[PDB]
Design a protein around this ligand. Structure first.
Ligand SMILES: NCC[C@@H](O)C(=O)O
Ligand SMILES: [Mg+2]
Length: 240
């Protein structure tokens, strides 16, 4: 099993390609100021992570800004605060400001020479365009939660993706699903019969950050600590 066996990379975006943690910590600062407490980054991230997937179950057809607005309301409620409409809007429209990780553009541009690059992300189409402008590549296919009518880890998100790629001549065996999230991505990839590459962005940190806790450790086929490290691996695999 090696990287060159695959024709397509299918990606998790937020937490793998885009550094959503930096974005969420920054966007929660005004709400946090109202509590009087200094929170650590992990505290902010974990209250997000206990709330985002429940919200996506609650409103599975919501656009992502509406998810984020409702997550703001959930966090405010854990903190004993009444929501403030303008603060909620500033949080919920913050994806425009969530940066790429510093290795992402270079890695994606390299990998685009060798694979079809696909997005399977908990996002809506228009919102994703904002992030795509920070990623430096044309994606061959983009599958969003909006397209499916639900969010990962719903199995239908993976079936939709697999089907779309089959119609473009990419068999399931051709796909390498590339993602940080054990909960959103590699557990349902296991169940869907996909090969997995774990991009362990938090390898040097505690817990899962903004990502929901996974119910088990899925079985992954590759692990890289960053996207640059995946690209460097491919440059040697290609010589074989
Ligand atoms: N890392 C969790 C979120 C991600 O899977 C995405 O849908 O972009
Ligand atoms: Mg509710």
């Amino acid at each position: 099993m090696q990287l060159t066996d695959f024709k397509a990379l299918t990606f998790d975006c937020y937490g793998t390609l885009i550094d959503w943690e930096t974005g969420i910590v920054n966007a929660l600062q005004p709400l946090a100021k109202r509590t009087g407490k200094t929170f650590t980054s992990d505290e902010l991230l974990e209250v997000f992570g206990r709330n985002e997937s429940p919200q996506q179950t609650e409103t599975p057809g919501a656009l992502y800004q509406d998810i984020l607005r409702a997550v703001y309301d959930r966090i405010a409620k854990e903190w004993g605060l009444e929501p403030d409409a303008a603060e909620r809007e500033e949080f919920g429209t913050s994806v425009k400001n969530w940066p790429a990780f510093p290795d992402t553009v270079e890695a994606l541009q390299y990998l685009k020479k060798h694979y079809k690059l696909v997005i399977l992300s908990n996002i809506d189409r228009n919102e994703f365009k904002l992030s795509n402008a920070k990623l430096g590549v044309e994606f061959d296919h983009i599958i969003t939660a909006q397209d499916v009518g639900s969010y990962k880890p719903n199995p239908n998100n993976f079936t939709y993706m697999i089907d779309a790629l089959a119609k473009a001549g990419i068999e399931k065996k051709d796909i390498l699903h590339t993602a940080e999230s054990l909960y959103h991505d590699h557990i349902p990839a296991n169940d869907a019969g996909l090969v997995s590459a774990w991009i362990y962005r938090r390898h040097g940190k505690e817990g899962y950050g903004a990502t929901h806790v996974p119910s088990r450790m899925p079985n992954v086929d590759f692990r890289f600590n960053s996207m640059g490290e995946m690209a460097e691996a491919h440059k040697q695999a290609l010589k074989g």
